[PDB]
Amino acid sequence: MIIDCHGHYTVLPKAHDEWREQQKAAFKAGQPAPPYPEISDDEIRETIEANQLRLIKERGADMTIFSPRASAMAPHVGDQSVAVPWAQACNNLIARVVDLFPETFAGVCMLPQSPEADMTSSIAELERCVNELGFIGCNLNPDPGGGHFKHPPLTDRFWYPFYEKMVELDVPAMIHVSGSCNPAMHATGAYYLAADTIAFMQLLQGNLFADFPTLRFIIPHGGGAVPYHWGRFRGLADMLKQPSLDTLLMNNVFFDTCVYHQPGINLLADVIDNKNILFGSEMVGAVRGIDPTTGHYFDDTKRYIDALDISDQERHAIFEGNTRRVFPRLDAKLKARGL
Amino acid sequence: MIIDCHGHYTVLPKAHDEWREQQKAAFKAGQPAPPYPEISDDEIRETIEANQLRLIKERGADMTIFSPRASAMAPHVGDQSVAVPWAQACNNLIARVVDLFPETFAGVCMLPQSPEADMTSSIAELERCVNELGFIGCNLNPDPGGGHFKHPPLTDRFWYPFYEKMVELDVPAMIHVSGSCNPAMHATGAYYLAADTIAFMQLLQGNLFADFPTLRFIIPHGGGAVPYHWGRFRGLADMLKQPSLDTLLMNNVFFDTCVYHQPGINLLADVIDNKNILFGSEMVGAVRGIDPTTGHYFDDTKRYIDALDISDQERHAIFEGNTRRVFPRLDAKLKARGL
Ligand SMILES: [Zn+2]
Ligand SMILES: [Zn+2]
């Protein structure tokens, strides 16, 4: 089995983006937001079937772990009064897609984070999503201010009440920022990668997993700059007098394979331990075109693992095993289906 | 010839970092600057001979392109009254080093940048360092605020008068942030690399080198995250409806070889055209220790170049050929010595 660990609901029913701009325009006008529209299951079936389900079929995947659209999380302007109904509405959409397609999609939640609030409503939405909607994970935005890193590092006690709910519920988080309000910083091509790189160093500077020994993070997009500069990060453990990386982090930190070329993927498999590598592609996302240089899709990352010269034990772990051990609720669901 | 294009004067005379802390502490009230100390040729020569030159010898290099200490250039709080005398004092030390060891060190200057100012004083110090001190390039800081990316992208018209001076003096710039004022961002493990990645995407969003076709940038640390995610950046060129990377950027953008492990060095060599790779090591810098996994130093990047399977012309471009074309003034100085 091939479980795609990274994916967002990007091609949406039209009334959803419509309401989102009315909710945005009503808040900056001092008005309440209009009622959320009704969306048909056939409309939801249409968006999914035309896009995600088609490519999963073509590309030989079985499941995709599905979360709200990453750019549209935009936890900026304005406040919690926008963030909570928006986060709730997007995850309700994710829950409905799983209802219509439960053998293929597993849910991961966005959180109603915003710069002016602590993690109280996100702990609520995580609980609502895991307990009532059957979700298996969350998306954690390390900079809900969106491009100036004006929020505390992930080792800060600001985050500690949130991590306790994660560990009790046994759910991991993918560190994942959203849209950028910084003109100097494009989101999907720079801001995503910088936050990944910064997040990994933040953990390297501290000892979070001394406090939460079972807490597990995924840093997406092959870990930002990190495997490419792996030797730089090992040497900094020594420069900081910190424990070696294999013990400090790599039992709690895992990287996905949304690196969009064979040489980036060849390097990931070469430098990061097989158990820390999770298959992902983030299809219908940042890079939707074909590679002139290969004739295959950029985000068809299975082709890079499939082209690797690895053992079947290694193929099983990237494609299915690693994700099921980091997401226990998904392992438990697949056992209960005999898989 | 073996020229290390990236290197800082990191081990300083005691009074310099001392005077830096008094210039900071005097500004902590309303005071002018304390007396700048006198520094001897023998003290300076000692630090160089105990450090950089000894390692050049053992690592078998001929030249180092030398710039002020990068972490301590960081002009946080406050303004030009600090940034200009600090840069002048810093650049003088590099000038004196080259005076003492001129066949071995070539000078590149830091600039008097600060968040509230334009490039007027930066233009002056570059002219002063190039015209009067004979420098061959500069270090250009895209975020002097020290950790928040609150400054305009490198494509903005804010930067154009400075590029005009770079263009007239025939000096390139290495894109370089400094120390971090962000609690969420360690400098050498995140901020250095995060800025490199953000800098490259900014230029990919626009067409700066249509305006300044002779403008040349070096993005250090193997391009930050950039070669590792080259397919993501190529695929984003189509997503942005933009010209291809080889034509939009790769006649004007150069990457050094400060990637501190063989597989990262293997990837950079693999995806970046030979003409865009400049040998560097940033020795005695962020990572000063030995690699347990290899038995050689992390920052001994020449050893990684030596292990590549490339032609002698290809080795020639990395070690001597590419940098002599990007720093014409040094080509002319080396030509003027018959080499
Ligand atoms: Zn994503
Ligand atoms: Zn440097």
PDB file of N, CA and C in Angstrom, chain A residues 36-108:
ATOM      1  N   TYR A  36     -23.141  30.543   5.838  1.00  0.00           N
ATOM      2  CA  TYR A  36     -22.355  29.662   4.984  1.00  0.00           C
ATOM      3  C   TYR A  36     -23.267  28.943   3.989  1.00  0.00           C
ATOM      4  N   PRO A  37     -22.857  28.815   2.725  1.00  0.00           N
ATOM      5  CA  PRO A  37     -23.743  28.217   1.726  1.00  0.00           C
ATOM      6  C   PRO A  37     -23.903  26.725   1.942  1.00  0.00           C
ATOM      7  N   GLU A  38     -24.924  26.193   1.318  1.00  0.00           N
ATOM      8  CA  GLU A  38     -25.078  24.762   1.296  1.00  0.00           C
ATOM      9  C   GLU A  38     -24.204  24.248   0.166  1.00  0.00           C
ATOM     10  N   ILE A  39     -23.583  23.089   0.367  1.00  0.00           N
ATOM     11  CA  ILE A  39     -22.779  22.461  -0.676  1.00  0.00           C
ATOM     12  C   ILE A  39     -23.272  21.034  -0.841  1.00  0.00           C
ATOM     13  N   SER A  40     -23.470  20.615  -2.084  1.00  0.00           N
ATOM     14  CA  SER A  40     -24.000  19.289  -2.321  1.00  0.00           C
ATOM     15  C   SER A  40     -22.862  18.281  -2.284  1.00  0.00           C
ATOM     16  N   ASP A  41     -23.212  17.051  -1.946  1.00  0.00           N
ATOM     17  CA  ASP A  41     -22.240  15.978  -2.020  1.00  0.00           C
ATOM     18  C   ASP A  41     -21.809  15.753  -3.461  1.00  0.00           C
ATOM     19  N   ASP A  42     -22.703  15.999  -4.421  1.00  0.00           N
ATOM     20  CA  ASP A  42     -22.344  15.814  -5.824  1.00  0.00           C
ATOM     21  C   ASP A  42     -21.320  16.862  -6.260  1.00  0.00           C
ATOM     22  N   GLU A  43     -21.455  18.091  -5.753  1.00  0.00           N
ATOM     23  CA  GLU A  43     -20.462  19.129  -5.994  1.00  0.00           C
ATOM     24  C   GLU A  43     -19.128  18.760  -5.364  1.00  0.00           C
ATOM     25  N   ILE A  44     -19.159  18.309  -4.116  1.00  0.00           N
ATOM     26  CA  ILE A  44     -17.941  17.820  -3.479  1.00  0.00           C
ATOM     27  C   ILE A  44     -17.394  16.612  -4.230  1.00  0.00           C
ATOM     28  N   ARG A  45     -18.271  15.692  -4.637  1.00  0.00           N
ATOM     29  CA  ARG A  45     -17.823  14.536  -5.412  1.00  0.00           C
ATOM     30  C   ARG A  45     -17.172  14.965  -6.713  1.00  0.00           C
ATOM     31  N   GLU A  46     -17.669  16.053  -7.313  1.00  0.00           N
ATOM     32  CA  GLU A  46     -17.166  16.547  -8.592  1.00  0.00           C
ATOM     33  C   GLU A  46     -15.730  17.060  -8.482  1.00  0.00           C
ATOM     34  N   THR A  47     -15.486  17.990  -7.547  1.00  0.00           N
ATOM     35  CA  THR A  47     -14.149  18.550  -7.358  1.00  0.00           C
ATOM     36  C   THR A  47     -13.117  17.461  -7.056  1.00  0.00           C
ATOM     37  N   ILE A  48     -13.447  16.532  -6.156  1.00  0.00           N
ATOM     38  CA  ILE A  48     -12.495  15.485  -5.796  1.00  0.00           C
ATOM     39  C   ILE A  48     -12.248  14.547  -6.966  1.00  0.00           C
ATOM     40  N   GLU A  49     -13.316  14.143  -7.656  1.00  0.00           N
ATOM     41  CA  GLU A  49     -13.204  13.114  -8.676  1.00  0.00           C
ATOM     42  C   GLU A  49     -12.452  13.614  -9.890  1.00  0.00           C
ATOM     43  N   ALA A  50     -12.579  14.908 -10.197  1.00  0.00           N
ATOM     44  CA  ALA A  50     -11.916  15.455 -11.368  1.00  0.00           C
ATOM     45  C   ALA A  50     -10.417  15.595 -11.168  1.00  0.00           C
ATOM     46  N   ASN A  51      -9.966  15.606  -9.926  1.00  0.00           N
ATOM     47  CA  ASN A  51      -8.612  16.021  -9.612  1.00  0.00           C
ATOM     48  C   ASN A  51      -7.920  14.956  -8.776  1.00  0.00           C
ATOM     49  N   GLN A  52      -8.087  14.993  -7.453  1.00  0.00           N
ATOM     50  CA  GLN A  52      -7.296  14.119  -6.599  1.00  0.00           C
ATOM     51  C   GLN A  52      -7.501  12.660  -6.966  1.00  0.00           C
ATOM     52  N   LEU A  53      -8.767  12.232  -7.095  1.00  0.00           N
ATOM     53  CA  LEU A  53      -9.061  10.818  -7.329  1.00  0.00           C
ATOM     54  C   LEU A  53      -8.514  10.343  -8.670  1.00  0.00           C
ATOM     55  N   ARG A  54      -8.536  11.206  -9.682  1.00  0.00           N
ATOM     56  CA  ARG A  54      -7.972  10.854 -10.976  1.00  0.00           C
ATOM     57  C   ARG A  54      -6.481  10.606 -10.887  1.00  0.00           C
ATOM     58  N   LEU A  55      -5.753  11.482 -10.190  1.00  0.00           N
ATOM     59  CA  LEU A  55      -4.293  11.370 -10.175  1.00  0.00           C
ATOM     60  C   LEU A  55      -3.821  10.220  -9.294  1.00  0.00           C
ATOM     61  N   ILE A  56      -4.463  10.027  -8.132  1.00  0.00           N
ATOM     62  CA  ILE A  56      -4.218   8.850  -7.300  1.00  0.00           C
ATOM     63  C   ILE A  56      -4.315   7.578  -8.144  1.00  0.00           C
ATOM     64  N   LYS A  57      -5.392   7.464  -8.926  1.00  0.00           N
ATOM     65  CA  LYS A  57      -5.589   6.334  -9.833  1.00  0.00           C
ATOM     66  C   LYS A  57      -4.440   6.206 -10.831  1.00  0.00           C
ATOM     67  N   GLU A  58      -4.129   7.289 -11.562  1.00  0.00           N
ATOM     68  CA  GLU A  58      -3.048   7.235 -12.550  1.00  0.00           C
ATOM     69  C   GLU A  58      -1.708   6.909 -11.913  1.00  0.00           C
ATOM     70  N   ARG A  59      -1.433   7.496 -10.755  1.00  0.00           N
ATOM     71  CA  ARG A  59      -0.134   7.394 -10.107  1.00  0.00           C
ATOM     72  C   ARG A  59       0.002   6.218  -9.150  1.00  0.00           C
ATOM     73  N   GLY A  60      -1.001   5.359  -9.039  1.00  0.00           N
ATOM     74  CA  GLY A  60      -0.823   4.133  -8.284  1.00  0.00           C
ATOM     75  C   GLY A  60      -0.798   4.290  -6.781  1.00  0.00           C
ATOM     76  N   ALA A  61      -1.504   5.283  -6.259  1.00  0.00           N
ATOM     77  CA  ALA A  61      -1.652   5.455  -4.828  1.00  0.00           C
ATOM     78  C   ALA A  61      -2.967   4.852  -4.381  1.00  0.00           C
ATOM     79  N   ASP A  62      -3.026   4.537  -3.094  1.00  0.00           N
ATOM     80  CA  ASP A  62      -4.202   3.971  -2.452  1.00  0.00           C
ATOM     81  C   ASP A  62      -4.939   4.970  -1.585  1.00  0.00           C
ATOM     82  N   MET A  63      -4.185   5.777  -0.839  1.00  0.00           N
ATOM     83  CA  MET A  63      -4.710   6.773   0.073  1.00  0.00           C
ATOM     84  C   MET A  63      -3.896   8.039  -0.067  1.00  0.00           C
ATOM     85  N   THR A  64      -4.470   9.134   0.423  1.00  0.00           N
ATOM     86  CA  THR A  64      -3.791  10.418   0.565  1.00  0.00           C
ATOM     87  C   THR A  64      -4.255  11.001   1.890  1.00  0.00           C
ATOM     88  N   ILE A  65      -3.338  11.466   2.724  1.00  0.00           N
ATOM     89  CA  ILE A  65      -3.775  12.114   3.952  1.00  0.00           C
ATOM     90  C   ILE A  65      -4.064  13.584   3.685  1.00  0.00           C
ATOM     91  N   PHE A  66      -5.324  13.977   3.889  1.00  0.00           N
ATOM     92  CA  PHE A  66      -5.943  15.143   3.277  1.00  0.00           C
ATOM     93  C   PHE A  66      -6.256  16.202   4.334  1.00  0.00           C
ATOM     94  N   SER A  67      -5.863  17.446   4.072  1.00  0.00           N
ATOM     95  CA  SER A  67      -6.057  18.527   5.023  1.00  0.00           C
ATOM     96  C   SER A  67      -6.538  19.744   4.253  1.00  0.00           C
ATOM     97  N   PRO A  68      -7.028  20.787   4.937  1.00  0.00           N
ATOM     98  CA  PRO A  68      -7.506  21.972   4.219  1.00  0.00           C
ATOM     99  C   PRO A  68      -6.404  22.633   3.403  1.00  0.00           C
ATOM    100  N   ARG A  69      -6.835  23.372   2.387  1.00  0.00           N
ATOM    101  CA  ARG A  69      -5.927  24.072   1.486  1.00  0.00           C
ATOM    102  C   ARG A  69      -4.989  24.991   2.263  1.00  0.00           C
ATOM    103  N   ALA A  70      -3.688  24.862   1.962  1.00  0.00           N
ATOM    104  CA  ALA A  70      -2.633  25.436   2.797  1.00  0.00           C
ATOM    105  C   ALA A  70      -2.536  26.947   2.640  1.00  0.00           C
ATOM    106  N   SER A  71      -2.593  27.438   1.405  1.00  0.00           N
ATOM    107  CA  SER A  71      -2.510  28.877   1.173  1.00  0.00           C
ATOM    108  C   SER A  71      -3.710  29.624   1.752  1.00  0.00           C
ATOM    109  N   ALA A  72      -4.895  28.996   1.731  1.00  0.00           N
ATOM    110  CA  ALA A  72      -6.147  29.602   2.179  1.00  0.00           C
ATOM    111  C   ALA A  72      -6.331  29.534   3.697  1.00  0.00           C
ATOM    112  N   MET A  73      -5.412  28.880   4.442  1.00  0.00           N
ATOM    113  CA  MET A  73      -5.512  28.938   5.895  1.00  0.00           C
ATOM    114  C   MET A  73      -5.411  30.384   6.338  1.00  0.00           C
ATOM    115  N   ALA A  74      -4.510  31.142   5.678  1.00  0.00           N
ATOM    116  CA  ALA A  74      -4.177  32.550   5.878  1.00  0.00           C
ATOM    117  C   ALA A  74      -4.620  33.013   7.252  1.00  0.00           C
ATOM    118  N   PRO A  75      -3.865  32.695   8.326  1.00  0.00           N
ATOM    119  CA  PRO A  75      -4.343  33.070   9.665  1.00  0.00           C
ATOM    120  C   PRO A  75      -4.095  34.533  10.010  1.00  0.00           C
ATOM    121  N   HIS A  76      -3.901  35.370   8.982  1.00  0.00           N
ATOM    122  CA  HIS A  76      -3.650  36.797   9.144  1.00  0.00           C
ATOM    123  C   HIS A  76      -4.947  37.529   9.432  1.00  0.00           C
ATOM    124  N   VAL A  77      -5.067  38.742   8.884  1.00  0.00           N
ATOM    125  CA  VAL A  77      -6.274  39.560   8.977  1.00  0.00           C
ATOM    126  C   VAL A  77      -7.505  38.693   8.720  1.00  0.00           C
ATOM    127  N   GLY A  78      -8.293  38.503   9.770  1.00  0.00           N
ATOM    128  CA  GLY A  78      -7.975  39.169  11.015  1.00  0.00           C
ATOM    129  C   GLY A  78      -7.803  38.351  12.275  1.00  0.00           C
ATOM    130  N   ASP A  79      -8.858  38.224  13.074  1.00  0.00           N
ATOM    131  CA  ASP A  79      -8.646  37.640  14.383  1.00  0.00           C
ATOM    132  C   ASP A  79      -9.381  36.315  14.537  1.00  0.00           C
ATOM    133  N   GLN A  80      -9.542  35.889  15.790  1.00  0.00           N
ATOM    134  CA  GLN A  80     -10.144  34.596  16.058  1.00  0.00           C
ATOM    135  C   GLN A  80     -11.557  34.538  15.530  1.00  0.00           C
ATOM    136  N   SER A  81     -12.251  35.677  15.515  1.00  0.00           N
ATOM    137  CA  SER A  81     -13.631  35.702  15.041  1.00  0.00           C
ATOM    138  C   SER A  81     -13.730  35.259  13.586  1.00  0.00           C
ATOM    139  N   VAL A  82     -12.640  35.375  12.832  1.00  0.00           N
ATOM    140  CA  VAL A  82     -12.561  34.836  11.476  1.00  0.00           C
ATOM    141  C   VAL A  82     -11.979  33.425  11.475  1.00  0.00           C
ATOM    142  N   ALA A  83     -10.942  33.199  12.292  1.00  0.00           N
ATOM    143  CA  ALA A  83     -10.138  31.985  12.190  1.00  0.00           C
ATOM    144  C   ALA A  83     -10.927  30.737  12.551  1.00  0.00           C
ATOM    145  N   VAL A  84     -11.756  30.811  13.584  1.00  0.00           N
ATOM    146  CA  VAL A  84     -12.478  29.639  14.075  1.00  0.00           C
ATOM    147  C   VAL A  84     -13.563  29.197  13.095  1.00  0.00           C
ATOM    148  N   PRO A  85     -14.498  30.059  12.671  1.00  0.00           N
ATOM    149  CA  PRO A  85     -15.502  29.593  11.696  1.00  0.00           C
ATOM    150  C   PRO A  85     -14.899  29.167  10.376  1.00  0.00           C
ATOM    151  N   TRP A  86     -13.778  29.789   9.989  1.00  0.00           N
ATOM    152  CA  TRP A  86     -13.051  29.393   8.789  1.00  0.00           C
ATOM    153  C   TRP A  86     -12.387  28.030   8.957  1.00  0.00           C
ATOM    154  N   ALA A  87     -11.669  27.830  10.069  1.00  0.00           N
ATOM    155  CA  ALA A  87     -11.031  26.540  10.314  1.00  0.00           C
ATOM    156  C   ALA A  87     -12.070  25.434  10.453  1.00  0.00           C
ATOM    157  N   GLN A  88     -13.147  25.703  11.191  1.00  0.00           N
ATOM    158  CA  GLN A  88     -14.231  24.736  11.322  1.00  0.00           C
ATOM    159  C   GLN A  88     -14.859  24.383   9.979  1.00  0.00           C
ATOM    160  N   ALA A  89     -15.128  25.392   9.144  1.00  0.00           N
ATOM    161  CA  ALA A  89     -15.769  25.147   7.854  1.00  0.00           C
ATOM    162  C   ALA A  89     -14.891  24.302   6.923  1.00  0.00           C
ATOM    163  N   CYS A  90     -13.576  24.557   6.909  1.00  0.00           N
ATOM    164  CA  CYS A  90     -12.670  23.819   6.024  1.00  0.00           C
ATOM    165  C   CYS A  90     -12.534  22.361   6.449  1.00  0.00           C
ATOM    166  N   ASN A  91     -12.449  22.124   7.757  1.00  0.00           N
ATOM    167  CA  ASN A  91     -12.330  20.765   8.272  1.00  0.00           C
ATOM    168  C   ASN A  91     -13.635  19.999   8.126  1.00  0.00           C
ATOM    169  N   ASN A  92     -14.781  20.694   8.219  1.00  0.00           N
ATOM    170  CA  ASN A  92     -16.058  20.057   7.910  1.00  0.00           C
ATOM    171  C   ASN A  92     -16.076  19.587   6.467  1.00  0.00           C
ATOM    172  N   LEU A  93     -15.470  20.367   5.573  1.00  0.00           N
ATOM    173  CA  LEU A  93     -15.363  19.952   4.179  1.00  0.00           C
ATOM    174  C   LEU A  93     -14.479  18.717   4.049  1.00  0.00           C
ATOM    175  N   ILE A  94     -13.370  18.683   4.803  1.00  0.00           N
ATOM    176  CA  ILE A  94     -12.471  17.531   4.807  1.00  0.00           C
ATOM    177  C   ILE A  94     -13.177  16.311   5.370  1.00  0.00           C
ATOM    178  N   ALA A  95     -13.951  16.495   6.436  1.00  0.00           N
ATOM    179  CA  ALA A  95     -14.723  15.387   6.983  1.00  0.00           C
ATOM    180  C   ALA A  95     -15.737  14.853   5.970  1.00  0.00           C
ATOM    181  N   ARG A  96     -16.384  15.741   5.202  1.00  0.00           N
ATOM    182  CA  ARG A  96     -17.358  15.298   4.199  1.00  0.00           C
ATOM    183  C   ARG A  96     -16.707  14.530   3.052  1.00  0.00           C
ATOM    184  N   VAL A  97     -15.529  14.970   2.595  1.00  0.00           N
ATOM    185  CA  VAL A  97     -14.801  14.266   1.535  1.00  0.00           C
ATOM    186  C   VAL A  97     -14.457  12.853   1.982  1.00  0.00           C
ATOM    187  N   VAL A  98     -14.068  12.701   3.249  1.00  0.00           N
ATOM    188  CA  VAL A  98     -13.803  11.376   3.800  1.00  0.00           C
ATOM    189  C   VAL A  98     -15.090  10.569   3.890  1.00  0.00           C
ATOM    190  N   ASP A  99     -16.213  11.210   4.251  1.00  0.00           N
ATOM    191  CA  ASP A  99     -17.493  10.501   4.247  1.00  0.00           C
ATOM    192  C   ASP A  99     -17.812   9.959   2.864  1.00  0.00           C
ATOM    193  N   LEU A 100     -17.661  10.797   1.835  1.00  0.00           N
ATOM    194  CA  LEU A 100     -17.939  10.350   0.479  1.00  0.00           C
ATOM    195  C   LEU A 100     -16.887   9.369  -0.027  1.00  0.00           C
ATOM    196  N   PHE A 101     -15.617   9.523   0.389  1.00  0.00           N
ATOM    197  CA  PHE A 101     -14.505   8.678  -0.072  1.00  0.00           C
ATOM    198  C   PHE A 101     -13.659   8.159   1.094  1.00  0.00           C
ATOM    199  N   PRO A 102     -14.207   7.286   1.953  1.00  0.00           N
ATOM    200  CA  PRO A 102     -13.499   6.933   3.205  1.00  0.00           C
ATOM    201  C   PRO A 102     -12.341   5.947   3.087  1.00  0.00           C
ATOM    202  N   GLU A 103     -12.282   5.137   2.025  1.00  0.00           N
ATOM    203  CA  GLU A 103     -11.235   4.133   1.855  1.00  0.00           C
ATOM    204  C   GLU A 103      -9.952   4.687   1.251  1.00  0.00           C
ATOM    205  N   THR A 104      -9.984   5.951   0.815  1.00  0.00           N
ATOM    206  CA  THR A 104      -8.987   6.651   0.022  1.00  0.00           C
ATOM    207  C   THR A 104      -8.437   7.888   0.710  1.00  0.00           C
ATOM    208  N   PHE A 105      -9.238   8.610   1.486  1.00  0.00           N
ATOM    209  CA  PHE A 105      -8.780   9.833   2.139  1.00  0.00           C
ATOM    210  C   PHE A 105      -8.833   9.675   3.652  1.00  0.00           C
ATOM    211  N   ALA A 106      -7.797  10.171   4.327  1.00  0.00           N
ATOM    212  CA  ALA A 106      -7.771  10.295   5.778  1.00  0.00           C
ATOM    213  C   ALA A 106      -7.594  11.759   6.153  1.00  0.00           C
ATOM    214  N   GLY A 107      -8.274  12.202   7.206  1.00  0.00           N
ATOM    215  CA  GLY A 107      -8.361  13.617   7.517  1.00  0.00           C
ATOM    216  C   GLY A 107      -7.248  14.128   8.423  1.00  0.00           C
ATOM    217  N   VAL A 108      -6.791  15.335   8.125  1.00  0.00           N
ATOM    218  CA  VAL A 108      -5.879  16.070   8.981  1.00  0.00           C
ATOM    219  C   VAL A 108      -6.427  17.488   9.061  1.00  0.00           C
TER     220      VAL A 108
END
